[PDB]
C-alpha cells in the first residue's frame, strides 16, 4: 500500500514515498521525502540546453530514486519534470534518454498542469475556502490558480520565474541596481497580466495562498523580522501568514543589499542569487490582484501528484 512520486525541478529533485490508506476515507501518510541536489541549473548551456553532465546527474537521481522506492515496497515511481526540462530545447530528448538508461520517464508537464496539481498539494496542506487564488512561483514560471475547496477552476502560467527574471533583468553594479531590477520585474509582471484582468483579482472573501521555495523563504524571513525563531526551530512555515506590507518591507530591505548580503538575511539563505527578482515577482503579482494577506503552504506539486494517484 505504498506509492512513490517524484518531481525534477531545476536545482533539486525530490522523491516522496507515502502509504496509501484504506480507500474508504482514503488519504495518505508521508513515509519519507528524499532530496537529490541535481543542480540542473548549472548544467544548462548558453542556449539553455541540458549538458551531458546534466543528463548524467538526472539519470543518477532517477536510478537512486527508483531503488529507494523499490526497497521501500512502493513499486513504480511517477516522475514529473517542471521548468528546467520544460524550457530546455532538448528537454524531451533528455527525458527519453533518461528513460532508456533508468527505466523511469521524467514526464515534462506544462506550467498549467503543474499549477493544477500544486493546488491539490496546497489543499491538503492549508485550509482552502470558497474562493482561493494561489500563486506558485518556480524557477521558470509563475502559476496563477483560482478555485474553491476541492480543485482548480482556472489556471494561468506566465514566464515570470525567479531564475528567469533574475536572468532577464541583470543587476548592475550601482547602488540602485536592486531597486531598478525590482521595478523592471514589477513592470514585466503587470504587462503579462494585462491581457488577464479580473481572472485572479480579489473579490470579497477571496483568500490568497503561496507555495514553493521563494514564498517559504519569504515567510521565514518575515517571521524572523517580527522577532521569531528560524523556521527550522519552529517546525516549518506551513500555514504562516504575512501581509503585503510585510512583503514590501522585506523586498525594500533586499533591494538595498548586494547578492552576497541577501544570502545573509535570515530566512533567505540559499536564495541570495534570485531572491530579489523573486520577491519582486510575488509583490507585484499580489499587489496587482489586490491581495492584502497570504497564507503559505508547504504542500505543492509532489503532494498534488499523490492526491491524483490516489
Ligand atoms: Na511555478
Author numbering: 1 to 310
Task: List sentences from the manuscript.
Degradation of polyP into phosphate is involved in phosphorus cycling, and exopolyphosphatase (PPX) is the key enzyme for polyP degradation in bacteria. The PPX hydrolyzes and releases the Pi progressively from the linear polyP chain. Bacterial PPXs share conserved catalytic domains 1 and 2 belonging to the catalytic N‐domain, and most members of the PPX family contain two additional domains 3 and 4 in the C‐terminal. The exopolyphosphatase belongs to the ASKHA (Acetate and Sugar Kinases, Hsp70, Actin) superfamily protein, which utilizes a common fold for binding and catalyzing hydrolysis of ATP phosphoanhydride.
We determined the crystal structure of the N‐terminal domain of DrPPX. Superposition of apo‐ and NTD structures of DrPPX revealed that truncation of the C‐terminal led to an enlargement of the cleft between domain 1 and domain 2 of the N‐terminal. This suggested that the C‐terminal probably exerted a force on the N‐terminal active regions. The result indicated that C‐terminal domains might “pushed” domain 1 toward domain 2, which was consistent with the comparison of apo DrPPX and NTD crystal structures. The root‐mean‐square fluctuation (RMSF) values of residues in domain 1 (1–120 AA) of the NTD were higher than those of apo DrPPX, indicating that residues in domain 1 of the NTD tend to be more unstable, which may affect polyP binding and catalysis. Moreover, the NTD of DrPPX exhibited a substantially decreased enzymatic activity compared to that of full‐length DrPPX. Compared with the NTD, the CoM distance between the loops in the binding pockets of WT, −5AA, and −8AA gradually decreased.
